[PDB]
Design a binder for this molecule. Structure first.
Ligand code: HEM
Ligand code: HEM
Ligand SMILES: N=C(NCCC[C@H](N)C(=O)N[C@H]1CN[C@H](C(N)=O)C1)N[N+](=O)[O-]
Ligand SMILES: N=C(NCCC[C@H](N)C(=O)N[C@H]1CN[C@H](C(N)=O)C1)N[N+](=O)[O-]
Ligand SMILES: C[C@H](O)[C@H](O)[C@H]1CNc2nc(N)[nH]c(=O)c2N1
Ligand SMILES: C[C@H](O)[C@H](O)[C@H]1CNc2nc(N)[nH]c(=O)c2N1
Ligand SMILES: OC[C@@H](O)[C@@H](O)[C@H](O)[C@H](O)CO
Ligand SMILES: OC[C@@H](O)[C@@H](O)[C@H](O)[C@H](O)CO
Ligand SMILES: [Zn+2]
Lengths: 410, 407
C-alpha cells in the first residue's frame, strides 16, 4: 500500500511506504482519532522475533544482509536468549539502535541531526555513584562550553523488572518548584512533586526561583540516591532583550542543556529504562512554553505591563505582542552568550528538508503534526502546511511511568 | 470504550461516551494516524433515515411515541414508493443545526443552536438561487451585526439534477496570473476566476475584485450573477498606530460564507447549502494575508516597520504577523462589523466543550483545525486533548463541480 502526503503551500506530494513496517499501535481506530491525546519483563517467546527484526534491519543498513556474519549473529543471539532469556547488544548495534530511536521519534522536529549523535555506553555501570559520574561526563561533553553536541548515555537494560536503572529526574537539569502555604508557587510549577521527593530524600532546598535540582539516581533496582551536579558544569543564560533594558530586571534565565532523562529506549526487544539524551533548544520551548504557559513561569502579564500594552481587552493582542518580545529575548540572549539554540523558523525549515530527504532515501518519515508545529506563529512556519503520517517504528523512545509510583522501597 | 480527555493546563478530565454513536470512518487505523491530512439505494436510505428520526424524536422527548412510530413508517413507505423522502420543516432545522453542532473543525460551535435556517427547497432555477442568496447575504450581514444562517436548496435526486454553488464561498476576491509570472489578487481563486472569465464575466483586473456567483440549478449549466455591490460589506484595513498601514491598500469582506460543502441529514444529500457566521480574526490576518500562497504580505509589512529581515532569529515575521492581526481586528471593530479574536473564540470553545460533555456525553473536535494559526499555546485549546470522530447530520466535502459537470 502507498500513502500520499501533500504540502498545501508548495503542492509537493510525497509517497510513503515506510509505514508498512510499522508494528506498534497508535491509539486511533478506523472510527476515532486520538492524534491530540498526550499518552494514548518480556518472554523468550516474544523476544527473539523482536531481536531478529532489529538485526535484519541493522545488517541491511551495513549492506551485509544474508552474510555469514549476519547469520552467525542471529544464531549467537538465539542461543543466548534460549540460554539466558535475554541477550547483549554489540557496541555497534547499540549505536545504530540509539540513532534510529531518534530518527524514528515522530514528535521531534530536530531529527535532521539524527546521524550525529554521540553515544556513551554506560552498560558496565553498577551503582548510583557510578551513574552520577557518567551523567557528569555527559553534561560536560554535551555542553562543550556552549557549542552543544547531541549525546545519549545508556545504562544497563532491564532484566527481571526488579533491578531497573532509573534517573528519577524528568530532565538532567531543571529548576525546583515549591508550593507555598498561600497556594502560590515559587520556581517552576512543573517540578513541585519531584522537588518534594528530593527534599524528603534529604535535599536542602535553597528555595529560590531558579534552583537547579539535584539528581536522584536509581541503580540496579535499589532505592535512589541524591547528587548535586557540579555548578561549574551547569551552563545558564541570563535573559535580556536587545531593545528593552528593563527586561534583564525581570530576573529571568534558563539552563542551556535540554536533557530528557525519563524515557525508555527500546532496541531489539531490549528495554533501557535509563537513557538520558540531549541536543539543544528550539527557542519557543523556553520563550513560549516554559515562560508563558499559565502553568509554568507565567510571565505574560508582567512583561505586558512593562511594555505598557492595552491589557483591558484581548483584542489588542497584548499577549501575542509580549510573547514575541520574550522569544526575541531568549534567542538574542543565547546567541549573545554563544550558546547553541535554534529559532522555530530555521528548525521547521530544516525539518521539511529532512522530511523530504527521508521520504526519498527511506520511503517515509513518521511525524506528529500536533507536536512538530511550533507553539507560536504556527502557520508562518512551513510545517503547518505539511500533511504528515504518524506511526511507530522501532527502535524507539517511549514513555514510562514515573518511578515513585512503581518503585518498591527497601 | 469510555474514553477520557484531559486539559493539561487545568487538569480537568472529561469522559466521552458520544463517540460510541459514530458510524463514519476517520481515515486512521491502529497502525497509522492521519489526523493532519486535509482530505482523508433504498436499502441504504431507510436505516439512515431511521437513525436520524430516532435522534430527532429523542431530542423532542417523544422517543418511542406513536408520533415517532407513525413518522418512521410514513418515511419508510415513502422511500419504498418514491426511492427517497422529504424532511418536515422541523426535521430540516434540527438537522442543519446539528450538522453544525457536529462539525469537528469549527471553533465557534458554542453558537450552534442559534442558526437561522432558510428553506430553499422550492427553488427551481439559477435566478431563484441568486435571489435566495442575496436574501441570505443581506440577512446575515445585518448592517455589520452578523447573524449565522444557512440556505438549503433542493436535495439530490439521481445525481444529474444537482443544485450547486460553484463558488467556494458566496463572497471571494478574484485571482489572475499576470505576464510577470506573478499573481494579481487572491491566488487561491485563480482557477475559479478563469472559469468565470471564460463563462462571460468581465474582470476589473484589480487586487480585490468581488467574484460573481456561478449558480447551477437542477443539473443545468451554471449562470453568472453580480451580487449587488451594496450587499457586499467590506472593511478597509488600517492600523491603530501605523498610519502607513492604510497605504498597503488592504481590505477584506465581512461575511465568511462557505458555499461548496454538502449537508447530509437522515441520508438525504443537500449539495447546495451555503452557510455563514462571522470571522475569527486570525482567518484573515494570519492565513489570507500572510500565507505564502495567499496575499503573502509579510515582507511588505516588515519593510514598512523597518525590521531587521537579515536573520530569521530577529523574529521579524512574527512581529509583523502580530501587527497585521491587530490591524484586522481594529478595522472590523472600528467599522462595527462583527469579528472575534482567537483568545475569545477559543475560550468560548472550551466552555462549549464542557457544556457538550456534560449534556451530550462529548464533542467531536479536530485539534489540528481548532488551534489558531498563531500563538497556539497561549490559547486554552492547545492544552486541551480532543477526540475526533464523525457524527451525522454533517457537513462534508464534495468534488468541485467543474470536474464533474457535463455541459
Ligand atoms: C539537536 C537538537 C534537537 C532539537 C532542536 C530538538 C527539538 C525538539 C523539540 C522542540 C521537541 C518538543 C519538545 C517539547 O515540546 O516538549 C522534541 C521532542 C523530542 N525529541 Fe528532539 N530535539 C533535538 C535533539 C534530540 C535528541 C538528541 C533526541 C534523542 C536522541 C531527541 C528525541 C526527541 C524525542 C523522543 C522527543 C519527544 C519527547 C516527548 O515526547 O516528550 N531530540 N525535540
Ligand atoms: C458564528 C461564528 C463562527 C465562527 C467564529 C466560526 C469559526 C470557524 C473557523 C475559524 C473555522 C476554520 C476555517 C478555516 O480555517 O478555513 C471554521 C470551520 C468550519 N465551520 Fe465554523 N464558525 C462559525 C460559524 C459556522 C456556521 C454558521 C457553520 C455552519 C452552519 C459552521 C461550520 C463550519 C465547518 C463545517 C467548518 C470546517 C469547514 C472546512 O472544512 O473547510 N461554522 N469555523
Ligand atoms: N530540545 C529538546 N527538547 C525536549 C526537552 C525540553 C522540553 N521543552 C520539555 O520540557 N519537555 C517535557 C515537558 N513536556 C514533555 C511531556 N511529555 O510531558 C516532556 N531536547 N533535546 O534533546 O534537544
Ligand atoms: N468563519 C468561517 N470560516 C470558514 C470560511 C473562511 C475560511 N477563512 C477559509 O478561507 N476557508 C477555506 C480555505 N481553506 C478551507 C479548506 N477546506 O481548504 C476552506 N465561517 N463561518 O461560517 O463563520
Ligand atoms: C493536548 C495537546 O496534545 C498537548 O497540549 C500537546 C500539543 N502539542 C505539543 N507540542 C509540543 N512540542 N509539546 C507539547 O508539550 C505539546 N502538547
Ligand atoms: C496540512 C495541514 O493539515 C493543514 O495545513 C491544516 C492545518 N490546520 C488548519 N486549521 C484550520 N483552521 N484551517 C486550515 O486550513 C488548516 N490547514
Ligand atoms: O514534578 C514532577 C513532574 O515533573 C513529573 O511528574 C513530570 O510530569 C513527568 O516526569 C513527565 O515529564
Ligand atoms: O480557484 C478555485 C479554488 O478556489 C477551488 O479549487 C477551491 O480550492 C475548492 O473549492 C476548495 O475550497
Ligand atoms: Zn488519528
Amino acid at each position: 500500500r502507498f500513502l500520499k502526503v501533500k504540502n498545501w503551500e508548495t503542492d509537493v506530494v510525497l509517497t510513503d511506504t515506510l509505514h508498512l513496517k510499522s508494528t506498534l499501535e497508535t491509539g486511533c481506530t478506523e472510527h476515532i482519532c486520538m492524534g491530540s491525546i498526550m499518552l494514548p519483563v518480556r518472554t523468550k517467546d516474544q523476544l527473539f522475533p523482536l531481536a531478529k527484526e532489529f538485526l535484519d534491519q541493522y545488517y541491511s543498513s551495513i549492506k551485509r544482509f544474508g552474510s555469514k556474519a549476519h547469520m552467525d549473529r542471529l544464531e549467537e543471539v538465539n542461543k543466548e536468549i534460549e540460554s539466558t532469556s535475554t541477550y547483549q547488544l554489540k557496541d555497534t548495534e547499540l549505536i545504530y539502535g540509539a540513532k534510529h530511536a531518534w530518527r524514528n521519534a515522530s514528535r521531534c522536529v530536530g531529527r535532521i541531526q539524527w546521524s550525529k549523535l554521540q553515544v556513551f555506553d554506560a552498560r558496565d555501570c553498577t551503582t548510583a555513584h557510578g551513574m552520577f559520574n557518567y551523567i557528569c561526563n555527559h553534561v560536560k561533553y554535551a555542553t562543550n562550553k556552549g557549542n552543544l553536541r547531541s549525546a545519549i548515555t545508556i545504562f544497563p537494560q532491564r532484566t527481571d523488572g526488579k533491578h531497573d536503572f532509573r534517573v528519577w529526574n524528568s530532565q538532567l537539569i531543571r529548576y525546583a518548584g515549591y508550593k507555598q502555604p498561600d497556594g502560590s508557587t515559587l520556581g517552576d510549577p512543573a517540578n513541585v512533586q519531584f522537588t518534594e521527593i528530593c527534599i524528603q530524600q534529604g535535599w536542602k532546598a535553597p528555595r529560590g526561583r531558579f534552583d537547579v535540582l539535584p539528581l536522584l539516581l536509581q541503580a540496579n533496582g535499589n532505592d535512589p540516591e541524591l547528587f548535586q551536579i557540579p555548578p561549574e558544569l551547569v551552563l545558564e543564560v541570563p535573559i535580556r532583550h536587545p531593545k528593552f533594558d528593563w527586561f534583564k530586571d525581570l530576573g529571568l534565565k534558563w539552563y542551556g542543556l535540554p536533557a530528557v532523562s525519563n524515557m525508555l529506549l527500546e532496541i531489539g526487544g531490549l528495554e533501557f529504562s535509563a537513557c538520558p539524551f540531549s541536543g539543544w533548544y528550539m527557542g519557543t520551548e523556553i520563550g513560549v512554553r516554559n515562560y508563558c504557559d499559565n502553568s509554568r513561569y507565567n510571565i505574560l502579564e508582567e512583561v505586558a505591563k512593562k511594555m505598557d500594552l492595552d491589557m483591558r481587552k484581548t483584542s489588542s493582542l497584548w499577549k501575542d505582542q509580549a510573547l514575541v518580545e520574550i522569544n526575541i529575548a531568549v534567542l538574542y540572549s543565547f546567541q549573545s552568550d554563544k550558546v547553541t539554540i535554534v529559532d522555530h523558523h530555521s528548525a521547521t525549515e530544516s525539518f521539511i528538508k529532512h522530511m523530504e530527504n527521508e521520504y526519498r532515501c527511506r520511503g517515509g518519515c513518521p511525524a506528529d503534526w500536533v507536536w512538530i508545529v511550533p507553539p507560536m506563529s504556527g502557520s508562518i512556519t512551513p510545517v503547518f502546511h505539511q500533511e504528515m503520517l504518524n506511526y511507530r517504528l522501532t527502535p524507539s523512545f517511549e514513555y514510562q511511568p514515573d518511578p515513585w509510583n512503581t518503585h518498591v522501597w527497601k
